[PDB]
Design a protein around this ligand. Structure first.
Ligand SMILES: [Cl-]
Lengths: 112, 101
């Protein structure tokens, strides 16, 4: 049942943590696709965005605000990209909701 | 473009097809409040931002994206942000690659 993010959350797998509160955790991606690449994850183990529900509204907004706050802290003033992958066609890696934040280089278009 | 290209509307947001699609399904979720960039959202926007994500995933289901899809928000020049109003892109109907641009 638990994904590897369970170890990130319980600190049994050391990670470069940029932000933490009782709702979420932000840590660097160890397979980075940009000079800055971090993940914002809820502590509630919502597996994918398609499985979020109305009761998650506050949490989801909080994740976006934390993403943009952390982007500022990481010096992404010239721009960045937020990405959420759902399921196989979305190339979702781990089945625990995560927002990717990529910056520090020019992002291309299309976005994959 | 036609009125039916607005896939969803409420007092908080509008959802409409992208006329320069990058996938067989490609639509855009925008707030009615004119937040220019995600980097300029503020704490007061918490509920609105969560609503936009829920609307994105609800509309993805309505558009038949049951095998996966991708949400993208671009900020500024390095993000390739193309209009200075907040847009959540939703892309589906094909395999999305990695990296995401
Ligand atoms: Cl954009």
């Amino acid at each position: 049942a638990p994904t590897i993010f369970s170890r990130i959350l319980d600190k049994s797998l050391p990670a470069d943590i940029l932000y933490e509160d009782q709702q979420c955790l932000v840590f660097r991606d160890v397979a980075p696709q940009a000079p800055v690449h971090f993940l914002v994850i809820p502590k509630k183990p919502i597996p994918r965005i398609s499985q979020a529900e109305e009761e998650d509204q506050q949490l989801l907004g909080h994740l976006l605000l934390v993403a943009k706050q952390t982007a500022k802290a990481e010096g992404l003033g010239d721009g960045y990209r937020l990405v959420i992958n759902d399921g196989k066609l979305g190339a979702q890696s781990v089945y625990h909701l995560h927002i990717h934040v990529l910056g520090g280089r020019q992002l291309q278009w299309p976005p994959g």
